Amino acid sequence: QIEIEWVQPGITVTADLSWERNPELAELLWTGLLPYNSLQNHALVSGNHLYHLIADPRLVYTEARYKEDRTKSPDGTVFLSQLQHLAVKYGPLTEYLPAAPVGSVVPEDIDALREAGRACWKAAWETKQPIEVRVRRKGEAVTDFALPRTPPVDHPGVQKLVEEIQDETERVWITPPAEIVDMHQGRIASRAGSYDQYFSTLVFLNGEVRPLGYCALNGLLKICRTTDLTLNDLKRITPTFIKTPAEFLGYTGLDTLWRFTQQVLTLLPDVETREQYFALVNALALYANMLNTWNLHFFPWQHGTDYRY
Amino acid sequence: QIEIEWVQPGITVTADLSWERNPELAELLWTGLLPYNSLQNHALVSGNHLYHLIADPRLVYTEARYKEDRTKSPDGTVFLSQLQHLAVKYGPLTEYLPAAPVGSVVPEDIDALREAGRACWKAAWETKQPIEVRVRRKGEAVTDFALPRTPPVDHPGVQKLVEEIQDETERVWITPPAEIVDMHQGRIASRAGSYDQYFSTLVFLNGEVRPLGYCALNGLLKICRTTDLTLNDLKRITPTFIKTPAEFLGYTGLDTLWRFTQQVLTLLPDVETREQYFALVNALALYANMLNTWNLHFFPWQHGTDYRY
Ligand SMILES: N[C@@H](Cc1c[nH]c2ccccc12)C(=O)O
Ligand SMILES: N[C@@H](Cc1c[nH]c2ccccc12)C(=O)O
Secondary structure: EEEEEOOOOOEEEEEEEEOOHHHHHHHHHHHHOOOOEEEEEEEOOOEEEEEEEEEOOOOHHHHOOOOOEHHHHOOOOOEEEOOEEEEEEEEEEEOOOEEEEEEOHHHHHHHHHHHHHHHHHHHHHHOOOOOEEEEEEOOOOOOOOOOOOOOOOOHHHHHHHHHHHHHHHHHOOOOOHHHHHHHOOOOOOOOOOOHHOOOHHHHHHHHHHHHHHHHHHHHHHHHHHHOOOOOHHHHOOOOHHHHHHHHHHHHHOOHHHHHHEEEHHHHHHHOHHHHHHHHHHHHHHHHHHHHHHHHHHHHHHHHHHHEEH | EEEEEOOOOOEEEEEEEEOOOOOOHHHHHHHHHOOOEEEEOOOOOEEEEEEEEOOOHHHHHHOOOOOOEHHHOOOOOEEEEEOOOOEEEEEEEEOOOEEEEEEOOOOHHHHHHHHHHHHHHHHHHHHOOOOOOEEOOOOOOOOOOOOOOOOOOOOOHHHHHHHHHHHHHOOOOOOOOOHHHHHHOOOOOOOOOHHEEOOOHHHHHHHHHHHHHHHHHHHHHHHHHHOOOHHHHHHHHHHHHHHHHHHHHHHHOOHHHHHHHHHHHHHHHHOEEEEEEEHHHHHHHHHHHHHHHHHHHHOOOOOHHHHHH
């Protein structure tokens, strides 16, 4: 049993964990991930779905034993995905992609859940109020949320950079990053956007950050942990999947993203172990995925009033 | 000397190619790429910048000898890009990323160039009328534009799928794909989009397709051609970068993309040679990059009127 606290709406629900179908994932949440906090997003495509990022690389490569069509899942079902989400269905879904269930919100708490889901939708559609979520073991108080830090690494250069990136990831974990807020308000040093408007810039912002985190960066992580591709080859293929997106994004306004990427690309040829490679890339990957949660939050979805079925 | 003809606005300019700075590039265009047609897009972020797609894998990995800041290039400058573009500056740019020049539209055609530039803008911004560009060696008239096909490959199953995919890419080269048009009109069988709107779906359609093409797929082509990564490893790493994006887009409405990806992923472990790997990923790659051009064309950029600096 776990509790899920949405702070701003002031709603807490309780969910039963199950080791029956996906024991490795249940065990991962129960033992390795809890307790944590995150920025709570609402799905913009999939339907009445809530997901939030968990700052732990294991979610990228841990396999499920059992997946089901998520639209057929009962409301209240809790999932874990390799996009590093914990997810909860609270109403109908259109996205029929397989998902890995690990439990469900107790029957007594479903109304609370749907109510909370609507509060989360309202925040992303209208108010832009960042909604903090706290997840912890049932009946275990926490007054200490801090992002995990990968074990230190025998390399002053790598470790220093890892710490810097992770620190920054924590700093803006539930606090809006200024470089994201600024772009949405048009405060953009480079004036990016054709013909004096920055709407397109926001679409490209929203568009490039997301795959860079979950696809390129997390892909490298997945490959690194689940295959025996050599360190030399990991090092070689990395600039190819991560340089251009970050560079273009740097111009649009993500100076910190692009700065971090340059320092990583700069250190990368000289790392000596797979452990060093992984901490370096993991730190950037989490930073990238963190930014996506804020784009999900801040992007003007409101325009969809003019795009109803 | 080449000729760039924009069909709809009835404008044809002449450009001098130069071997002074990027000989390998100028050569490739001159001997390898001409003549061709394409869909003319206009940059939505970079400024007064025209770019279109060229159906040749060599642009992905052929290296520039020289690059300069594009904001400082004279109006009229022609560039080739590893994004598979021929690009022309016709006014101020804000994107200061380096680009490889290969020539210039002649001085007496600059006015005609800026007319072509503004007309392409009108098509992206307001009209959504597809503009066809035709590019030729000066002198030699051209009647048939067919997409380049990779040389037949000693593997019938691979070769068949390669043919089917290339055929399809050719079919909707300058004629809009129904799957893209239908989505932008809300004709989406899965009703993807939270709370009965499909605007968010259009943002994600736009955002996911582009990196899948230029970053994941094209990245694998470049890795295959510019490094000696083993075939065994090329096959191992491929699904990690291309499955998840394609599956989600399939759900959102791109049935053909997801079907072509699944087929590629089924044949991929059976591939026997690098040449077989290359042709298979290359065909899927171009198709993906082809879809990007239509997203760039059809996405409702006009919303930018509420986002002026
Ligand atoms: N369903 C998420 C987005 C999403 C789900 N799976 C994906 C895979 C790739 C990219 C985006 C996604 C939303 O609507 O907010
Ligand atoms: N210039 C393109 C966008 C672009 C340029 N370079 C990129 C690299 C990655 C992604 C997008 C881009 C436009 O504004 O239309």
